[PDB]
Amino acid sequence: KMRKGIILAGGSGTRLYPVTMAVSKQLLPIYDKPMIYYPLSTLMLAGIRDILIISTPQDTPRFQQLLGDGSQWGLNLQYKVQPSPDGLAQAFIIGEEFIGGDDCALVLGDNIFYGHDLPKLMEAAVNKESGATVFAYHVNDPERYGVVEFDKNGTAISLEEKPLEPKSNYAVTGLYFYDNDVVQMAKNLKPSARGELEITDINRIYLEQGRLSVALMGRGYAWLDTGTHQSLIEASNFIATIEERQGLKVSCPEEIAFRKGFIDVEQVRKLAVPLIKNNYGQYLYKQTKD
Amino acid sequence: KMRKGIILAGGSGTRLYPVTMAVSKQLLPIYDKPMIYYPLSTLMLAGIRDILIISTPQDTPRFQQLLGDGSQWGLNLQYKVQPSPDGLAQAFIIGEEFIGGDDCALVLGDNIFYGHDLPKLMEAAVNKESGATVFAYHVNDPERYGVVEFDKNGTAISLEEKPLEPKSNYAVTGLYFYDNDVVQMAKNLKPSARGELEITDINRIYLEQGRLSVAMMGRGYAWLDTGTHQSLIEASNFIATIEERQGLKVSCPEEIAFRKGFIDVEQVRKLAVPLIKNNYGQYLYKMTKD
Amino acid sequence: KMRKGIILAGGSGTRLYPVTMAVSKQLLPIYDKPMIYYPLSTLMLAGIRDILIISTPQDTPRFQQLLGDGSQWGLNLQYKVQPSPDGLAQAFIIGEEFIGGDDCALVLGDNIFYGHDLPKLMEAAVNKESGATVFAYHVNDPERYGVVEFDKNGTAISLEEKPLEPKSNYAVTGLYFYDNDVVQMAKNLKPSARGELEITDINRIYLEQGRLSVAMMGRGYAWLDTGTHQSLIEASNFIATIEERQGLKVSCPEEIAFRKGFIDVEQVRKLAVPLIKNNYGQYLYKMTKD
Amino acid sequence: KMRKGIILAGGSGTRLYPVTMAVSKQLLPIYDKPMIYYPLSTLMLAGIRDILIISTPQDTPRFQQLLGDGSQWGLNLQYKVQPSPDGLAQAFIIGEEFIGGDDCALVLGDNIFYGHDLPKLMEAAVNKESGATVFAYHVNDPERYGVVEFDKNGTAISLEEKPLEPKSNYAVTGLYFYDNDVVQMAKNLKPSARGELEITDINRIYLEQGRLSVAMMGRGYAWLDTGTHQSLIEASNFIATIEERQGLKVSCPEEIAFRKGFIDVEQVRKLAVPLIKNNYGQYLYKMTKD
Ligand SMILES: Cc1cn([C@H]2C[C@H](O)[C@@H](CO)O2)c(=O)[nH]c1=O
Ligand SMILES: Cc1cn([C@H]2C[C@H](O)[C@@H](CO)O2)c(=O)[nH]c1=O
Ligand SMILES: Cc1cn([C@H]2C[C@H](O)[C@@H](CO)O2)c(=O)[nH]c1=O
Ligand SMILES: Cc1cn([C@H]2C[C@H](O)[C@@H](CO)O2)c(=O)[nH]c1=O
Ligand SMILES: Cc1cn([C@H]2C[C@H](O)[C@@H](CO)O2)c(=O)[nH]c1=O
Ligand SMILES: Cc1cn([C@H]2C[C@H](O)[C@@H](CO)O2)c(=O)[nH]c1=O
Ligand SMILES: Cc1cn([C@H]2C[C@H](O)[C@@H](CO)O2)c(=O)[nH]c1=O
Ligand SMILES: Cc1cn([C@H]2C[C@H](O)[C@@H](CO)O2)c(=O)[nH]c1=O
Ligand SMILES: O=P(O)(O)O[C@H]1O[C@H](CO)[C@@H](O)[C@H](O)[C@H]1O
Ligand SMILES: O=P(O)(O)O[C@H]1O[C@H](CO)[C@@H](O)[C@H](O)[C@H]1O
Numbered sequence A: 001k002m003r004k005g006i007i008l009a010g011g012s013g014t015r016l017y018p019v020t021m022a023v024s025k026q027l028l029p030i031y032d033k034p035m036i037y038y039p040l041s042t043l044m045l046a047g048i049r050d051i052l053i054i055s056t057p058q059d060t061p062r063f064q065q066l067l068g069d070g071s072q073w074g075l076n077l078q079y080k081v082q083p084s085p086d087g088l089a090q091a092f093i094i095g096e097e098f099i100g101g102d103d104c105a106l107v108l109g110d111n112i113f114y115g116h117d118l119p120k121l122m123e124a125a126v127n128k129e130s131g132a133t134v135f136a137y138h139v140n141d142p143e144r145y146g147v148v149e150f151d152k153n154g155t156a157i158s159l160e161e162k163p164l165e166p167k168s169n170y171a172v173t174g175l176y177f178y179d180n181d182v183v184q185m186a187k188n189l190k191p192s193a194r195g196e197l198e199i200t201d202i203n204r205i206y207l208e209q210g211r212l213s214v215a216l217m218g219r220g221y222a223w224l225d226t227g228t229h230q231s232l233i234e235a236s237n238f239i240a241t242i243e244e245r246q247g248l249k250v251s252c253p254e255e256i257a258f259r260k261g262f263i264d265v266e267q268v269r270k271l272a273v274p275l276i277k278n279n280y281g282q283y284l285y286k287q288t289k290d
Numbered sequence B, C, D: 001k002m003r004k005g006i007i008l009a010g011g012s013g014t015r016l017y018p019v020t021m022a023v024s025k026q027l028l029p030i031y032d033k034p035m036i037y038y039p040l041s042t043l044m045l046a047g048i049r050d051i052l053i054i055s056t057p058q059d060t061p062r063f064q065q066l067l068g069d070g071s072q073w074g075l076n077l078q079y080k081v082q083p084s085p086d087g088l089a090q091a092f093i094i095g096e097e098f099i100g101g102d103d104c105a106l107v108l109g110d111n112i113f114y115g116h117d118l119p120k121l122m123e124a125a126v127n128k129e130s131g132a133t134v135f136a137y138h139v140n141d142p143e144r145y146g147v148v149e150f151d152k153n154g155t156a157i158s159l160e161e162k163p164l165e166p167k168s169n170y171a172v173t174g175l176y177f178y179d180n181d182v183v184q185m186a187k188n189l190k191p192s193a194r195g196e197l198e199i200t201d202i203n204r205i206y207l208e209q210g211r212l213s214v215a216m217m218g219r220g221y222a223w224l225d226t227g228t229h230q231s232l233i234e235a236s237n238f239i240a241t242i243e244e245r246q247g248l249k250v251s252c253p254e255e256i257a258f259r260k261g262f263i264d265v266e267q268v269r270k271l272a273v274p275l276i277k278n279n280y281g282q283y284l285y286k287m288t289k290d
């Protein structure tokens, strides 16, 4: 088997109106590049080159307009519409045909992960033969999330979606790794009381079966909040501060494709020339020099 | 009998690539609302209700999709394409029919103005019967702008567009008020040394006629533009700080229309419905009960 | 240096622990200068040059080491210790000797005002023959402040300190102007239920006598929040944004002293040189020529 | 017995005037704690508990007031005054008696590191028998720092302080680990063009001997810049973003002490009780429960 990726970049957008009446949430800038460049880079860093992008009926075509078939970066990008935002777990029903019999990795379109040795963090998950792998990260508002409860020995024992009384402060991040089992699982799921096909219910099945690995994502990593306008600004500020300090970009898909060998120096130069008059294009071009 | 104005919301957007690749720059968020809400609010506060929005062949239809004919705000919006960004003064040539025999203001679609008594400042320019009014604002980088030269007495005696050697730090801001002569002046301009039809050349003609009011916009006002990725985040942080401190919004068009009597309580409530599930609709609703 | 003002710059420093464990809150930076430069500038803009700084037993000498007698800025500064932070009104009991038979302003050492025409905003207050003036500002958390209630016309009818059920969203700011009657009021006050000699109590006394003016400070002004660690950061960012956009400083006492004629070119040049390594001193020197 | 570290928390801070005429640079806040908590935590994370703090004649006492002898957090702190700011390397002369015949680390009082697995990054350096170790970090402005150059095989070949023509973009950060030889090297150093005994001259001696390890700090780590007013604001914002998202502090010495077993729950409770009136004590107290 191989592992195909799915970025779920849909959603009603209501939380951010009227900004998101104008622009899809996942095309909003996080400093110097559209939001979706970040989770796209996460999947690339995991070695995943074949990726299905799912958005809404109005928005999906705008992603396709930005990114194309991903061939310029050594990827294959495909697109599919989620008719209505009826649950994260619908991603697997929509991507049925795409996933075929392979393993997959689903990342939410608004999830931004930063930190040292991220690829090594994911490695085990990526490598996994069977089961599912999720990431737990300590937050101050776990009631917004899927919350994973750990026993006194550091074993996951329960998962609850947006509980009014959280059993802990560990949230389940928006990056998930699964074996080929998830599709049929999702296909057989029933909607929660709130009317959604829940990823948390998928994860609970793997747990219940003993097949769920819950990897801790330490405080040394940043998992940026993009839920509110204010948190968007902070995420932008955070990335700007890193980049302007380093002179390097965070989650620049061209850079990652080049450094991983998806594309070569000649391809980078071909990408950069047309863009040579803007700072983004100069960064690309500098990367081929030294 | 509505007062008229133009929002010039075009341009390539290449400096911000790839943020502007799938998103019109003037639809990008500034904290909690699309960028174009700011200069639109500015014209509204000047008492201008009949507005023409000019953008590129590809982006104009997107503003039209978002704002419509503006009657929901008690305005009249129309739209026109600028084929190529051949100069600010071209607004008046493209807008000739729209302007007819009337006075007309211009504001750039990426300009954000804030400060005490801003409405009184613009009302004064609007009241002017013959001639034009522009605003001079002290900046750090005058060479990016139209620049004003003052005599020993503080009288403006000349203007230069993007001078290699600026004569002062006072830039001409992106808000302008004209009488009906601006159309004929625009149609008579020749391309400048930068190949553009310059509004600075129009302002110079008024100044030489002795009909240009150069209103000093003191350091107590904030005039921001959205020139870099960093400036955009800086503008968003600036507006978030004022709004979260005050509980009041900056450049909320629905709120300005209501306060200026463009629309009534019933209409505000209708506008609030699609937005009612977040802070923005809630703010609109609350303002109809206090 | 005839007109008089008091900056109250003490407090428990509990809320910001441990940042205020060994540093006075009012010596903390707000971007490029110590916090106290802001309210000191405000008094200077009101035309006040004789100023008493009140701080704690441990920090008073630090202020005095920093600012000296004020002669270098054409001011007359003096200092007194507040033994314990027993209340804002205590400023008039400690400052009894300094005030003498005169009118006096009080500004809180952590109060930062910015906006157009501030001196004119203050003018009626400074020039009031008898009574007092305070300024009201709409905030989103009035329960933190002295709250001014307003009748159906525009009349202040009540004041309450930190009300659980605030009667309006108008907070009384930390800038106050009084005739000479305040000293006796203060001396006759008893502490409130919070154990503080309250400035709200003085203000209600004038209000009940019909001698309190409540001037509105509109939404075009910024009255910055320095209450929390987060708000300190927002205050610094807000000032940084203005200053870097304009190439002008907000509340730079040297500049205001020069512009108002308190000190001459040779003196400003003297002051600039020890600061000339960074922008502060280069800004001042360039003020002087030409 | 205890391993040893020096924090150099002196300097004249001319580039931050007038902020640092008021307060020690190393007592400025970075969000919710004084700057010196960050470098102190870094030493603690490396397992270093016997630490000498050096500052100026005026501020040594204020650090003593803030931190005491350190036993409260299971540390041994002592203090020494550096009579004048004559260079980083004088740390070893002033500290000769403290260091004795032991290894020692030096951390600059303005050095802030954040990231995943920081203790492991430091592990080899702390365990080195012979020689020295510094850490290199890619920056956009290498000319401000000590710059380390590498050959095609990643071998460090040269080290220059503020090079006119930088040989790489890798800056040497402000955390250094030395064997006992550093004391004698320091005593033989001659002063810089800037009038300082330079840590880079120490480091060049080790490089010449083939004994300088240059650990590469990856881009997933952040090394916050505290060199300008603007960057100080960025550093604070960066920390606040991490903390408010996580509900956890970065570099809280009490927490580190508790987690490394230098102090035990009863002692954390003892520290917290007198501080429960403020948010920091509330945090300390919470550590000792769920
Ligand atoms: C519920 C739902 C969320 N979303 C997006 C919205 C948020 O960005 C994220 C988590 O709600 O996923 C979808 O793409 N589809 C959905 O069905
Ligand atoms: C290794 C690597 C990481 N990153 C970023 C993304 C994650 O935040 C973290 C990965 O270790 O840093 C890149 O942007 N490019 C890279 O080549
Ligand atoms: C020159 C030019 C600028 N613009 C816009 C782009 C920028 O947003 C702003 C200032 O150049 O004006 C146009 O819309 N048309 C033009 O011809
Ligand atoms: C209560 C009190 C506050 N303060 C100061 C600290 C801040 O500048 C402001 C806090 O309300 O007033 C005092 O100086 N003395 C006091 O008695
Ligand atoms: C004249 C002057 C005004 N101000 C400010 C303070 C307020 O923001 C505004 C007052 O109108 O301008 C300065 O900061 N420095 C000055 O030299
Ligand atoms: C009344 C009002 C003012 N303004 C702005 C215009 C000025 O910048 C400032 C005036 O106090 O507030 C709004 O943005 N919306 C409003 O409803
Ligand atoms: C030059 C010098 C700097 N410092 C401090 C200031 C900075 O925080 C760090 C590097 O400048 O070292 C000293 O404590 N003593 C010194 O002699
Ligand atoms: C273990 C621990 C790590 N950290 C920080 C240091 C690094 O930035 C990251 C872990 O390497 O988190 C703390 O702030 N406190 C702690 O107790
Ligand atoms: O779509 P929701 O209900 O807002 O929330 C969803 O996304 C979050 C982002 O990681 C997860 O923590 C939740 O488990 C998931 O239910
Ligand atoms: O047309 P430009 O050069 O692109 O930019 C424009 O904006 C400025 C205000 O922002 C004016 O002062 C300049 O005439 C104008 O050219």
Ligand SMILES: O=P(O)(O)O[C@H]1O[C@H](CO)[C@@H](O)[C@H](O)[C@H]1O
Pocket: C088, C108, C111, C144, C145, C146, C147, C161, C171, C172, C173, C174, C199, C200
């Ligand atoms: O900071 P405090 O002491 O809590 O208090 C205060 O300042 C506010 C302004 O900053 C006022 O409206 C309050 O009346 C005053 O007591």
Ligand SMILES: O=P(O)(O)O[C@H]1O[C@H](CO)[C@@H](O)[C@H](O)[C@H]1O
Pocket: D088, D108, D144, D145, D146, D161, D171, D172, D173, D174, D199, D200
């Ligand atoms: O701040 P300074 O004294 O100029 O510089 C000092 O700190 C930098 C790290 O902060 C180092 O790379 C420099 O080599 C060191 O001399």
